[PDB]
Amino acid sequence: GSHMAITKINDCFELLSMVTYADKLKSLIKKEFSISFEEFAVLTYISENKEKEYYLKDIINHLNYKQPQVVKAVKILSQEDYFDKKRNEHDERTVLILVNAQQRKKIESLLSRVNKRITEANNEIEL
Amino acid sequence: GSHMAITKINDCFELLSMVTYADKLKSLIKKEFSISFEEFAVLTYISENKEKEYYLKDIINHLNYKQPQVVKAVKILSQEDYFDKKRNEHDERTVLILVNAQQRKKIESLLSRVNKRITEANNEIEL
Ligand SMILES: [Ca+2]
Ligand SMILES: [Ca+2]
């Protein structure tokens, strides 16, 4: 529906290339922007499914990084004040996060800058 | 010329998907086949540029894993007897990998089995 689907590879050399290309973009986003990929994944997940309230449960489900790293990312991002969030809410499932409609200017702007670096990197590397 | 080129992504959500998909195939190849990705990269590099004699120099150049991990991979693969390879006492020739003809069949055979797992994986994965 939205966003170009990723084309599947069917042999070793294509896999290797895909990984090489993905690793380069990952390291760049981290180098510049100084942010872990899990923080990146949480941030883009939030941007895709716009909301005011998110269940840390769902986020962890829709991502593939294991709670330890995810919660670790939510935590940091929370301090950076990308979204309030706050732990300790007892019973039910666990934790939830709050995305102030204005902290979203902070996120989508960060993601807009990453989108610009991505197209620049595509023009660059092109190995 | 040979092998489907990897299509570039141009935004965060596509990046994330590409990485998710690449990570799954990587972990599988490692889980099963029990082999590191650098060993995989060396092995597919060898299979792409068929030869009898390889300069560990070139291999390290054409790959993006830093000598430490590459040489570490060459070493193991060498014991596994995928290719002979002989070090030095000095000469700075810093290793020269040799793959006779039988070892080649061993390499291709293995990469051939890795190719079939990728296909089965593309049928399960589907995210
Ligand atoms: Ca192919
Ligand atoms: Ca797009």
Swiss-Prot record, chains A, B:
GO terms for molecular function: DNA binding; DNA-binding transcription factor activity; metal ion binding. Changing residue 93 to A: Unable to bind to the spa promoter; even. Fails to repress spa and aur expression; even. The keyword Lipoprotein does not apply. Its main location: cytoplasm. It is found in: Cytoplasm. Keywords: Activator, Cytoplasm, DNA-binding, Metal-binding, Repressor, Transcription, Transcription regulation, Virulence. Coiled coil: none annotated. Disulfide bonds: none annotated. Changing residue 26 to A: Able to bind to the spa promoter. Fails to repress spa and aur expression. Changing residue 92 to A: Able to bind to the spa promoter. Unable to bind to the spa promoter. Fails to repress spa and aur expression; even. Homodimer. Belongs to the SarA family. NCBIfam families: Staph_reg_Sar (TIGR01889), TF_SarA (NF038268). PANTHER family: ORGANIC HYDROPEROXIDE RESISTANCE TRANSCRIPTIONAL REGULATOR (PTHR33164:SF5), TRANSCRIPTIONAL REGULATOR, MARR FAMILY (PTHR33164). Global regulator with both positive and negative effects that controls the expression of several virulence factors and the biofilm formation process in a cell density-dependent manner. Required for transcription of primary transcripts RNAII and RNAIII generated by agr (virulence accessory gene regulator) locus. Negatively regulates the expression of spa (protein A) and aur (metalloprotease aureolysin). This is Transcriptional regulator SarA. It comes from Staphylococcus aureus (strain MW2).
